[PDB]
Structure 1
Amino acid sequence: TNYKPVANHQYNIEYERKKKEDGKRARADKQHVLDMLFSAFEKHQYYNLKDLVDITKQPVVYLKEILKEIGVQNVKGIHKNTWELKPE
Structure 2
Amino acid sequence: PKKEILDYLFKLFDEYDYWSLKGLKERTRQPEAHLKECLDKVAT
Q: What is the TM-score of this pair, normalised by structure 2?
A: 0.78
Q: How many percent of aligned residue pairs carry the same amino acid? A: 39
Q: How many residues align?
A: 44
**Residue from 33, 51, 56 that aligns with 2:23:** 51
The structure that is helix-richer by fraction is: 2
Q: Which consecutive unaligned segments of at least 5 residues does structure 1 have?
A: 1-28, 72-83
How much is the aligned-residue C-alpha RMSD, in angstroms? 1.2
Q: Which has the higher strand share?
A: 1
Moved over 2 A (4+): none
Q: In terms of Rg, which structure is larger?
A: 1
Q: Distance in 1 between matches of 2:5 and 2:21?
A: 14
Extract unaligned runs of 5+ from structure 2: none
| Aligned equivalent of 2:37 | 65
Higher relative contact order (CA 8 A, sep 6+): 2
